[PDB]
């Protein structure tokens, strides 16, 4: 899951860069925020589909699960808040390597594995192994969420 | 002075510094060298992503082309050590401004515009205007290579 880890880390970095330029407005849906990012070329290493020519581009992970970058309650009478990067249907093995990798990378403000929100951004191999669920045949059953300031 | 030109100049100085700091080993692929540079924070502000082949982070210029920082190994006849910075899909306008700008203040040991290698590190706008090819629609057709210490 080396490519996958690098993809989420860079997507986060690109998103932070893009958000530093937004002022006076905020994204109200992941669909729009994700399409804008794709338009800027912030997701080159991932699978892009949907309809980018119409501003409706969608992002996918290596296993065909959807990836969505969405605002995290944008609005605080000041500066832009945070956002989340959610990746779906992640297989068990990948879920463990990706969640622990993002923890070690240290750039998030929180990592979630299914219904487990590690707001301290610390996820160990022992924690991941337990929280990441078994695949259903060849289909991953894990949803990972990476948060980013806040 | 502009963002684009500055990007190349900061990339070069950061790479010179990184190579100087390496002790006991050497890069053998642009994939690895560029990843390390990105991990070193040398490309903050530029678009980055992940390479499905190696899992390494990739770097991307202002027009959608890739930027690859690679070490200069042995080319069966080549011996100009150091490294090169290659950027593709460069629009004609940028090709002329960037190549000339790098000639003026890039501190290179050579500048190549497509199949023209200015080993004296001197490129004038008259030359660049001729060597840089026209765009295909909004797509740039130029490849620039900045050679460092050969």
């Amino acid at each position: 899951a080396g490519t996958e880890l690098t993809n989420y880390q860079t997507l986060a970095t690109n998103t932070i860069g893009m958000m530093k330029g937004v002022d006076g407005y905020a994204f109200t849906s992941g669909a729009k925020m994700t399409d804008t990012l794709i338009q800027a070329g912030a997701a080159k290493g991932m699978t892009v589909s949907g309809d980018p020519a119409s501003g409706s581009a969608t992002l996918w992970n290596s296993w065909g699960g959807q990836i969505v970058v969405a605002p995290d309650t944008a609005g605080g009478t000041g500066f832009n808040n945070g956002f989340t990067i959610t990746t779906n249907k992640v297989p068990q093995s990948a879920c463990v390597s990706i969640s622990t990798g993002m923890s070690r990378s240290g750039g998030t403000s929180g990592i979630k594995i299914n219904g487990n929100n590690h707001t301290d951004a610390k996820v160990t191999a022992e924690i991941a192994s337990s929280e990441c669920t078994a695949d259903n045949g060849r289909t991953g059953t894990n949803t990972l969420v990476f948060n980013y300031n806040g | 002075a502009g963002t684009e030109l500055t990007n190349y100049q900061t990339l070069a100085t950061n790479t010179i510094g990184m190579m100087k700091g390496v002790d006991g080993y050497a890069f053998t692929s642009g994939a690895k060298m560029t990843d390390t540079l990105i991990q070193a924070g040398a490309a903050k502000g530029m678009t980055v992503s992940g390479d499905p082949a190696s899992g390494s982070a990739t770097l991307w210029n202002s027009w959608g082309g890739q930027i690859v920082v690679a070490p200069d190994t042995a080319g069966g006849t080549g011996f100009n050590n150091g490294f090169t910075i290659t950027t593709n899909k460069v629009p004609q306008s940028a090709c002329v401004s960037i190549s000339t700008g790098m000639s003026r203040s890039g501190g290179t040991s050579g500048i190549k515009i497509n199949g023209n290698n200015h080993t004296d590190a001197k490129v004038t706008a008259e030359i660049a205007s001729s060597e840089c090819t026209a765009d295909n629609g909004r797509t740039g057709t130029n490849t620039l290579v900045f050679n460092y210490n050969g």
Binding site: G41 | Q66, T86
Partner: peptide, 10 residues
Amino acid sequence: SXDXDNKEXX
């Protein structure tokens, strides 16, 4: 990446 980001690459 998406529109921004040619198909070529390097």
